[PDB]
Amino acid sequence: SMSSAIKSYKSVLRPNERKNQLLKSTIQCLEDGSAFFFKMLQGLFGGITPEIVRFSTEQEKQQQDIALWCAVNWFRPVSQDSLTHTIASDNLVEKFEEYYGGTASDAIKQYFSASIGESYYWNDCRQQYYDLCRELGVEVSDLTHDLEILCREKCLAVATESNQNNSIISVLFGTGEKEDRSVKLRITKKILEAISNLKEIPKNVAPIQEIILNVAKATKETFRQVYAGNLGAPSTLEKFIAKDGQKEFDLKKLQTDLKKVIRGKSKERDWCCQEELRSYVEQNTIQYDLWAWGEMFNKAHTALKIKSTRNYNFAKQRLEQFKEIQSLNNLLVVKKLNDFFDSEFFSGEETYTICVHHLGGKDLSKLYKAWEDDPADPENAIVVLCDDLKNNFKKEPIRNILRYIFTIRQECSAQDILAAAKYNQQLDRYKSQKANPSVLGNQGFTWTNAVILPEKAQRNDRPNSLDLRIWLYLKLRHPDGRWKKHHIPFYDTRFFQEIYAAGNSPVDTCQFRTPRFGYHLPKLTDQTAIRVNKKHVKAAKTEARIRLAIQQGTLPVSNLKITEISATINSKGQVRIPVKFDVGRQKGTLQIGDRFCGYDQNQTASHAYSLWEVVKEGQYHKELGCFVRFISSGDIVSITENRGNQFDQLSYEGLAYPQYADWRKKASKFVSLWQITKKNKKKEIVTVEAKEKFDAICKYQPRLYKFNKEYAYLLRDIVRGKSLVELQQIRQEIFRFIEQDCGVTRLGSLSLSTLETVKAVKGIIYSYFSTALNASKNNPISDEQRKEFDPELFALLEKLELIRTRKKKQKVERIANSLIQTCLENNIKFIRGAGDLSTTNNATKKKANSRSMDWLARGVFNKIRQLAPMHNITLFGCGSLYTSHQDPLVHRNPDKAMKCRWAAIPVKDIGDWVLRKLSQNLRAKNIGTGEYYHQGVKEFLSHYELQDLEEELLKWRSDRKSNIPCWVLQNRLAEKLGNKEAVVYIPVRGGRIYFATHKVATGAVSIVFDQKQVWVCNADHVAAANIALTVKGIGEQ
RNA sequence: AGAAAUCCGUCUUUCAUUGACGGAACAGAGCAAGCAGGGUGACAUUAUU
DNA sequence: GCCGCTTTCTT
DNA sequence: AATAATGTCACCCTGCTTGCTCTGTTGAAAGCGGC
DNA sequence: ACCCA
Ligand SMILES: [Mg+2]
């Protein structure tokens, strides 16, 4: 089978005033018709029966809840605009049972008990269906009969069975001549009876073709006429007759197809209310037009069906969450846990939900055992817990809660305490959970065959300026009600460059004239002579480069074979153009010669890729069941040049320290002039010279962008206590920092550090507004107040946020492009990546959550997933569980293999942070990764002959003054490695070195460490290799 | 069928009328968190009397 | 063959 | 025994901000009559 | 576990 993809383009229409009136009026007409279809289909779907759902559900492998599918169509949370029969939440179960003739399911209970937003109210759509029957003047059962026909013909979507596009318009209201269904039904059943009791099953299709022709009394040239009356798209049976007599025959496939045809054409389309419905629609919309009625129907039907499907799934998920909540409801331990706030440790006035992460989670057990281990005197067992449970990611537990839980350890078990906390937060999430309202929405309308084909375009090409217009030929509705086609232009130099410009190449032939699809435009020259308005030069440049290419006979012509292009337009005049293109044949399973890759996402370092190949002989991998060979690894990079100099937009950290003295200087000059104020417990003002903080920032010689982020924090600190008068000089300093020289509005890469810098600058302006307007708990301040006080600076707030948004969008796009070019350059057909990565949650520290919000791991994954099929590259999502620590080609080849990560530190640079990490890893005698870090330190001590230090390391605590200082350990390693510049390998979490069994990273070199031969590899490249060699899917397998 | 238009964006103490470059989009609903001030409440380190 | 309409299609 | 510096953790508030997921859409393929 | 001082 032939796999394809979709690219799209997007711009704004530029009609003249007359055609603009026509277009806006037509769109308003379509929108009014869409609203009418929305209300009417709301009622119609309120009319469905359990039989209709059963018939639409019957052939589905997963069993379906017919009652829930009825409920999500009979009762809908809605906006005021489609609210016709308001029903109180209290009577939902009663009225549902009345309609269903049976007691409500528990999932339906959960659907009805769910919260809905402020502006949505429950609507009884079955009552609306009854009133619609009255409005049409037809009996309820007659409209139900027509509804059965519509759902049977797939004109409407019911449950898991989707609609067939907009065929409802042609089927119910069409003016033309229909199929002869009885002929088809009879022929189909007699061939199925001719083909289900064969005494020999042929391996080719020819005897079957002969049987079908004999059954239909037809030849191969007449079969379409005989079977379908020459009407409609070719059926499965026609295509079967058409194929070469030598193709392999699939009996089960053909029988399945014939069964579908028999099922779908066993009954007539014998309408009862066809003409009433058609008069109703024509009266409440416009006169019959298949396309316009289709557009109205599409908008309304899509809205309703997505909401009802979502509510079905949501109700089932809600029932499961409720069952879980009811299981953990041990109810006396729950109340002891929550009696904390009434106990004598909570000295506060405002309570909060006690969560599992407030209790140290799993590790609570350890605390428990210590209490029964060393009772009566607890407290230091509490702090050993807390101190061993510090992370830069996880929220740390609350002391007073642990203290209080000592008081009830004898009766409430750790099992049940954690169960109670989990119950707490689950219940909280469950009361908050909201059902989904049905709303028409703001989607635009699609004109079919809307774009003038590029070869038929009307070009007013000047020798020094190409015609850059693309014209739509749209049907528009005039005030008298007649339709007429009109020409409307628009500009899109991307669409012009990739598709629309006329190509004149003898041999160049490509899908899209863009670098990632293999085409590079020729460069401009000194004889190019661009002279346009400034706000047009970039677009102009593109035009020029196309002109030159046509001038050289070098511009390729699109090989896409476009016969029609649609255009989607909204009320704002925006136009969207989709282009479907074939990407090639659907790949089979891995064979020898297929190349695959994996990629690793990081936030302070580059993303990494690892490229592998399936081979005939060599390294066997059990999980893959084949021989593999490592090709190469690399950093994911997106480089642009400035007058010869290269910059990686994804990772550039800015100028080195000695390079930005002047900038630094001005900051210094400002900060000498100011102090930082602060309020003492006893309220009193305490000041500090603000320049000490600046010196602390400078001492470690940061690069420009970290320096700007830290200086932004310092400016925010300076702003805090000031008067209105002080805030004005500080304001000139703020503007100068933001806009001149190296401020964020002029300099900054796409790196994570730059995004954090911009957010810190926004923090400065926020603090300025809060200080100026005297914000407090008793005086919340607002945006209107902020704009009233200082519109310029408020506008910067918005501008900085827009800068961040554009940076992140560009960065996701560039990361995906870089990986895709790596794959295309190395003929990689398979990409594999973590669909697992964290976003944010309560149990995580706020700073980690904020960084993850700027990290966009999910966005990068989704972008790779969007781009890869455009080159017939298959992406698989996988779990990231332990992918930073597995030993490539050893792990699960055949058993688990894991090692810690390492850092290369000069012996010189080994401080107390190193000793802290050594001590901490040496007590890391725990499950998970810590095992491997404990091992690590062991090897370290063995490799550097530092066993005698071990005990000093185990007692190293960040408080102790008896701690072994760092210079002992530096002196020992200097003794042994010869000098103070010598690299020492220290086992550290997040280290960039991995000691690998095999050469699994480009540039890795072999060493012997603790008498084991190992490859010193980029740890991120190793993680990418692990991801590449993963085979089991995200959830489990 | 009407000569205009950056389609949307990125980088650089370099801002470019020949600098180097990147991108399927859209709608609604829902979920998750962040920030600035202001408050509460634990702990730790410094020192001291 | 184009344009604009119809219909059926289980790929 | 405290008081106070300075610093790290958590938990609230009002009003603003963004990332991500769900369920979809942007039709396919043939013949007709009038040009 | 991913993410990192
Ligand atoms: Mg990594």
Beta-carbon contacts of residue A472 (< 8 Å; ≥ 6 apart) = A13, A447, A450, A451, A452, A487, A488, A489, A490, A567, A575
User: How far apart, in whole angstroms, are the C-alpha atoms of residue A615 and residue A241?
Assistant: 42
**Concatenated DSSP letters of A740-796:** STTSTTT---SSHHHHHHHHHHHHHHHHHHHHHTT--SSS---HHHHHHH-HHHHHH
Q: By the 8 A CB rule, do A729 and A674 touch?
A: no
Tell me, yes or no, whether A342 and A316 share the same domain. no
Nucleotide D18: nearest residue by CA–C1'?
A853
Q: DSSP letter string over A905-963?
A: EEGGG--HHHHHHHHHHHT--STTTHHHHHHHHHHHHHHTT-GGGHHHHHH--SS-SSS
Q: Are A854 and A756 in contact (CB under 8 A)?
A: yes
Q: What's the DSSP call for residue A451?
A: B
A 10 A CB-CB count for A831 gives 25
Residues paired with A77 in a beta bridge? A122
Residue A232, CB, less than 7 Å from strand C?
Answer: yes
Distance CA A143, CA A131 (A): 12
> Token pair for residue A896?
């688990």
Number of domains in chain A: 6
In terms of residues, how long is chain A? 1037
End residue of a domain, out of A403, A431, A459? A431
CA of A524 to C1' of B20 (A): 13
Residue with minimal CA–C1' distance to D15 is A782
Name the nucleotide with the smallest C1'–CA separation from A288: C5
Q: What interhelical angle do A274-284 and A17-46 show, nearest 10?
A: 140
Cα pseudo-dihedral A241, A245, A246, A251, rounded to 10: 40
Secondary structure letter of residue A462 according to DSSP: B
SS3 state of residue A20:
helix
Q: What is the DSSP string of A295-343?
A: HHHHHHHHHHHHHHHHHHHHHHHHHHHHHHHHHT--SSHHHHHHHGGGS
**Strand bridging mode A874-878 / A828-834:** parallel
Indicate if CB(A265) is under 7 A from strand C.
yes
- Cα torsion A418, A422, A425, A430 to 10°: value is -160
Contact call for residues A834 and A877 (beta carbons, < 8 A): yes
Query: What's the CA-to-centroid distance between A888 and ligand 1, angstroms?
Result: 14
Query: Tokens standing for A222?
Result: 């007449």
Number of alpha carbons in the 13 Å side-chain half-sphere of residue A822: 27
Asked if residue A343 and residue A260 are part of one domain, the reply reads no
Which string of b and e fits A287-316 if b means at least 16 CB within 10 Å? eebebbbbbbbbbbbebbbebbbebbebbe
Q: Out of A744, A779, A812, pick the residue that ends a domain.
A: A812
Are A921 and A934 a contacting pair, CB within 8 Å? yes
Helix (H) or strand (E) holding A11: strand A2-12
Q: Which residues contact A713 (CB under 8 A, 6 or more apart)?
A: A760, A763
Domain boundary residue, one of A368, A403, A431: A431
Amino acid at the residue A288: Y
Q: What is the Cα–Cα distance from A24 to A16, expressed in whole angstroms?
A: 12
Instruction: List all residues 6 or more positions away from A927 whose beta carbon is below 8 Å from its beta carbon.
Output: none
Ion ligand 1 residues within 5 Å by Cβ: A 600, 602, 1020, 1023
Give domain status of residue A753, yes or no. yes
- Between the CA of residue A448 and those of A294, A474, A476, what are the distances in Å? 12, 9, 13
From residues 52-111 of A, list those within 7 angstroms of strand C by Cβ.
Answer: none
Taking Cα atoms as reference points, which of A618, A623, A636, A591 lies closest to residue A999? Answer: A618
Same domain, A83 and A160: yes
Closest nucleotide over all strands to A882 (CA to C1'): E1
Asked whether residue A467 falls in the same domain as residue A569, the answer is yes
A1035 lies in a domain? no
Burial grade of A278 (CB within 10 A; 0-12, 13-18, 19 or more)? middle
- Residue type at position A324: E
How far does the centroid of ligand 1 lie from the alpha carbon of residue A356, in Å? Answer: 28
Q: How was this structure determined?
A: X-ray
Structural domain contains residue A820:
no
Q: Say how far A444 CA is from B26 C1', in Å.
A: 8
- Of the CA atoms within 13 Å of residue A271, those in its CB half-sphere come to 13
Q: Are residues A767 and A675 in the same domain?
A: yes
In terms of domains, do A157 and A42 share one? yes
Q: Are A718 and A771 in contact (CB under 8 A)?
A: no
Do A800 and A685 lie in one domain? The reply is yes
Q: State the residue range of the domain holding A392.
A: 328-431
Q: Over A974-1037, what HEC string results?
A: HHHHCCCCCEEEEECCCCCEEEECCCCCCCCEEEEECCEEEEEEEHHHHHHHHHHCCCCECCCC
Protein residue nearest nucleotide D10, by CA to C1': A398
Question: Nearest nt to A647, CA vs C1'?
Answer: B11
Q: Which residues pair with A13 in a beta bridge?
A: A490
Q: Are residues A410 and A508 in the same domain?
A: no
List the resolution, Å: 2.5
Q: Which residues put CB within 7 Å of chain E, the nucleic strand?
A: A 391-393, 600-605, 834, 836-838, 848, 852, 880-885, 913, 917, 928-930, 988-990, 1020, 1023
Bin A872: left if φ > 0, else alpha if -120 < ψ < 50, else beta: left
CA distance A432 to A114: 8
Residues A518, A515: Cα–Cα separation, whole Å: 5
**Does residue A261 reach within 7 angstroms of strand C, measured from its CB?**
yes
**Phi and psi at residue A1002, in whole multiples of 5°?**
-60, 130
Which distant-in-sequence residues (6+ apart) come within 8 Å of A1007 by Cβ?
A1013, A1014, A1016
Compute, in angstroms, the gap from residue A831 CA to the centroid of ligand 1: 17
Phi, psi dihedral angles at A41 (to 5 degrees): -70, -30
Does the nearest atom of strand C lie within 7 Å of A266's Cβ? no
A124: left (phi over 0), alpha (psi -120 to 50) or beta: beta
Separation of CA A884 and ligand 1 centre (Å): 6
Tell me how far apart the alpha carbons of residues A216 and A691 are, in angstroms, rounded to a whole number: 95
Nucleotide nearest to A170 (CA to C1'): C7
Give the distance (Å) from ligand 1 centre to CA of residue A1021: 8
Amino acid sitting at position A105: S
Residue A789 contacts residue A769 (beta carbons within 8 Å): yes
Same domain, A137 and A192: no
Q: What is the CA radius of gyration of chain A?
A: 35
Phi, psi (deg, nearest 5) at residue A588: -85, -165
Distance CA A312, CA A90 (A): 20
Q: Are A661 and A701 in contact (CB under 8 A)?
A: no
Q: How far apart are the C-alpha atoms of A749 and A808, rounded to whole Å?
A: 10
Question: A560 and A498: one domain?
Answer: yes
Q: Using the CB atom, is residue A841 less than 7 Å from strand C?
A: no
DSSP A508-560: -EESSSSGGGT--PPPP-TT------GGGHHHHHHHHHHHHHHHTT-PPEE-S
CA of A224 to C1' of D31 (A): 11
What's the per-residue H, E or C state across A613-656? EEECCCEEECCCCEEEEEEEEEECCCEEEECCEEEECCCCCCCC
Cα–Cα distances in angstroms (integers) from residue A583 to residues A300, A494, A863, A868, in the given order = 33, 20, 17, 10
